[PDB]
Design a protein around this ligand. Sequence first.
Ligand SMILES: *[C@@H]1O[C@H](CO)[C@@H](O[C@@H]2O[C@H](CO)[C@@H](O[C@@H]3O[C@H](CO)[C@@H](O)[C@H](O[C@H]4O[C@H](CO)[C@@H](O)[C@H](O)[C@@H]4O[C@H]4O[C@H](CO)[C@@H](O)[C@H](O)[C@H]4NC(C)=O)[C@@H]3O)[C@H](O)[C@H]2NC(C)=O)[C@H](O)[C@H]1NC(C)=O
Length: 277
Amino acid sequence: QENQDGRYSLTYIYTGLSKHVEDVPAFQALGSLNDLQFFRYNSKDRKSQPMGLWRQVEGMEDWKQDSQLQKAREDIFMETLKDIVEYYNDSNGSHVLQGRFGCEIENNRSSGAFWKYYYDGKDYIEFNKEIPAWVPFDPAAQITKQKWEAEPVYVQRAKAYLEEECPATLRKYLKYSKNILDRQDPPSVVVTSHQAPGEKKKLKCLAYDFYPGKIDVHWTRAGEVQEPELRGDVLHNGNGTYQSWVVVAVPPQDTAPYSCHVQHSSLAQPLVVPWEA
Ligand SMILES: *[C@@H]1O[C@H](CO)[C@@H](O[C@@H]2O[C@H](CO)[C@@H](O[C@@H]3O[C@H](CO)[C@@H](O)[C@H](O[C@H]4O[C@H](CO)[C@@H](O)[C@H](O)[C@@H]4O[C@H]4O[C@H](CO)[C@@H](O)[C@H](O)[C@H]4NC(C)=O)[C@@H]3O)[C@H](O)[C@H]2NC(C)=O)[C@H](O)[C@H]1NC(C)=O
């Protein structure tokens, strides 16, 4: 009777667009606790709203207050994207600035942190909290490097936000979310055959209503494992559950037995469902 393990992750993805249409929001931000997203905010609606299972959780976060400082961040974000675009003279062109910012804890202790920006998919700038300093990866990023380090203090706060302000927020959220994130829901599995007129028969094995997401689902033909013709995976965020299915194509003659094997953490011994033809 064996391992420790309690690692939890808090991540934000920020997205801006230089050229956007009326209905499409210019700025957007969402935050995830582990693999599940707990809140979104955009520049159109201009309101911080909780998402998924976190709609029923009260008093974890002052959403009105959060909207405020989200707005603050939106300003600094787009202003940066403007500066990149203005620098490349491509004022009229559809460009993307994406920002990833986050920390994580393992066994109650800070174990890692990251703060990185991307431009049109390419590495733009990055915080090295060891120095501490920002690290340009793009010629344009030299300007931002100078702005964000204008005062020597700024670099010290950036280190503080990652190393302390973030994990502090994480733990706070964890008081309300530990129960959610720690779930070990087993999958119900369902086998289904289907025939297309001028097509080989296809056997679908669906695993559903499970969490966490890490799952092995594979077919076997008369003992040997078969490579799937197609595999599908889904996260139902409102539900806070996962769904995953695998389809194999069985030749017209084939009389050999097919069974679906599901392996998930919430199960002691593996789950096997045979296709009762
Ligand atoms: C969280 O949310 C998700 C999505 O919002 C919910 O998904 C639903 O899950 C329930 C079970 O909790 C499913 O109920 C059905 O149960 C019977 C067994 O008693 C099964 O026969 C069903 O199996 C599905 O999949 C089969 C093969 O893949 C398919 O042949 C079958 O038709 C059925 O769903 C299919 O049919 C429906 C009806 O038209 C289609 O709408 C659906 O797209 C289709 N699915 C697929 C890809 O095959 C099935 O499990 C519901 O089917 C399922 N529905 C949805 C909208 O996803 C989930 O229930 C919920 N969980 C919790 C814990 O709250």
